[PDB]
Design a protein around this ligand. Sequence first.
Ligand code: EQK
Lengths: 76, 71, 607
Amino acid sequence: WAYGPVSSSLYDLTNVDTTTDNSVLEITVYNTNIDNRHEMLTLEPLHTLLHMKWKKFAKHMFFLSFCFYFFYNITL
Amino acid sequence: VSKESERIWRLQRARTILEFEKMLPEWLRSRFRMGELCKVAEDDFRLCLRINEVKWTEWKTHVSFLNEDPG
Amino acid sequence: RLKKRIFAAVSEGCVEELVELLVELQELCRRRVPDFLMHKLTASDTGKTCLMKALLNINPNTKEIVRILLAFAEENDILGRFINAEYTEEAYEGQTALNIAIERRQGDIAALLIAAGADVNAHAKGAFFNPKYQHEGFYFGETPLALAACTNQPEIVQLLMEHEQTDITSRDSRGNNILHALVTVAEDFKTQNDFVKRMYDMILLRSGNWELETTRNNDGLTPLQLAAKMGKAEILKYILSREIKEKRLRSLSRKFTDWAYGPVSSSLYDLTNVDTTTDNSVLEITVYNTNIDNRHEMLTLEPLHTLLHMKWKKFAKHMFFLSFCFYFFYNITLTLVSYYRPRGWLQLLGRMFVLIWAMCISVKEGIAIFLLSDAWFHFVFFIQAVLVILSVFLYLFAYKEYLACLVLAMALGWANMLYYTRGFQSMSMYSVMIQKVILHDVLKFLFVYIVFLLGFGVALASLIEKCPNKDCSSYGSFSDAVLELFKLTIGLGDLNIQQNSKYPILFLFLLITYVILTFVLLLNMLIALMGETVENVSKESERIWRLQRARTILEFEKMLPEWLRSRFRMGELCKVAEDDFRLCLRINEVKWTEWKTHVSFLNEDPG
Ligand SMILES: COc1ncnc(OC)c1C(=O)Nc1nc(C(F)(F)F)c(-c2ccnc(C(C)(C)C#N)c2)s1
């Protein structure tokens, strides 16, 4: 899409978007025996895919879970 | 502290997102389905994820693009 | 059929022979008149013609494809409606082949186009080129000159300006001219290498007059005022101190070295539209625009910094110290009135003085609120003044609940002395890092500690057993337990294992847990304020000091009448042109590094 200093790179999500048995994203997040993920989760499609999943549904579900747990705690 | 806090928070957020990811049913997950469609090859139509950007440093006569008309 | 055929042939450009054959076939079909050739040579969806389609896909064959296309359009003599043709879709409304050739950096083809009569001032006022939300669109000035200037193409900029049909004074759908666009797209040196300043200088001194800098856009701002409205520090630092040393263009400068003798020199800056004597100055914009977040650098520029300094040392220091003294005496009077409350010497004098001072300052702060850790002091000053006035009105009234308001007002005014202890370097740093502690960190620490208190209080008061001598255990009702936990945090409570518990071991465990965890929160607070802020405290203190000084100076400047302001009138007069005599602000300087045979000055003899 590039016009000038602006441009729209169109990345790929063939085997990256967790819609496969063993995707690259679920591997990169669920592999805790590598100890480098603080850098790997800043890569090109991984970072913004996490961001998009988050702002689409994970923020909502996480805040709902926080509210339910806070009410369970205050009622305890 | 500043760096370790952010790296452990980022790991936690990734885990929670991917967690929730599984907590949802198949139909709702397909209803979310991050990414779009895109034609690149003769017939590829694989999934894609647009990312706009701005760079003033490297000027190049653009030669490769899918849609010649920028939308 | 043949339309898309020629379109793909020219877009691929894999050969010119077949495109020439297609052109010959189209000409034969058109012979057996120009409107038909246009309709067949364009796509009526948007208007994208074969020339545009060729330029969009740069392959090494374009240099001849465009020549063949112009030759064909001249064969029917349709060049006018051919090259000057433009889009029609709501995205690129008006976009012309010239902006396409420039966006792809094809300079030679741009030359061939303008030689073919390409409309150079064709405005690309499309909803894409003028996007409201960024990152979807590229606003550049909507003009081929504006485009070749914003995308760092000086060759084509000179090629357009040296032409006669160009119009450097053109104005777009936003009112901007070329200079407004160059201001709008100038970001920062770390991301651009600052070519936009170079193109600014070139385009400015090329059209040599104040035509460009004097026009205002549909927002009523000039390119100088514009770069002031946004946070463009680099372009601003250039425009404010711009020296043109050529003779015939020397009148365009805003800084004239007029006095240099040796390593000493007296640059004579300009104060035409900078000195707050206009509707919206560059200085009042630079200080009152709080939505840019770069002023910590912009208020160190060439005439701005020293103009603030001069206004300060001329009248603002005096007025500010007077205000501090008046507020301190009003505060000591509140203190003495509080101390000597009734358990006209002490009543009438002091009470009427605090009444009038509080009412006037409350009206002042309230009307100050009506303008739109920077400026909440208006809120708190107004609140304290209303507190005093309500307290004294209730004292006059039939309500003995006035002492609460009065003593709270005293404690709040003594708190508000924090505003006025911004003045000197020691008190500035002290007050502002106290503010940073208070607002940044200890407040969230207090929140989490209050959650600790609530939880541990309910736990302990749930562990207690009623005494048959109910006062035999201090952790009685909830509020009692919370008080004891407070005292334990500060170090005044008592640790007695016999709290009439039913599980004394578990109660002792919970209590030790509370004190340990609040100890840990104290340590965490200590690290948060001893490792993080300590780096940038020195810089944040200075920038907040500077911004508050700018605001106070510019505020006092308004508080004065017209005659006294004209009596102050920072700056002097100075003759620089045939008849210019614009205001100026001398700044002596000393530089031993760059030795130059002085060539330009106003006074031959240094005074
Ligand atoms: C130099 O200050 C003084 N000099 C001499 N005597 C004084 O007291 C008589 C004082 C004094 O501190 N007065 C105060 N009043 C109040 C209030 F209750 F209105 F909020 C204060 C307060 C309360 C809670 N959080 C803050 C934060 C952390 C935001 C701050 N800052 C401030 S502080």
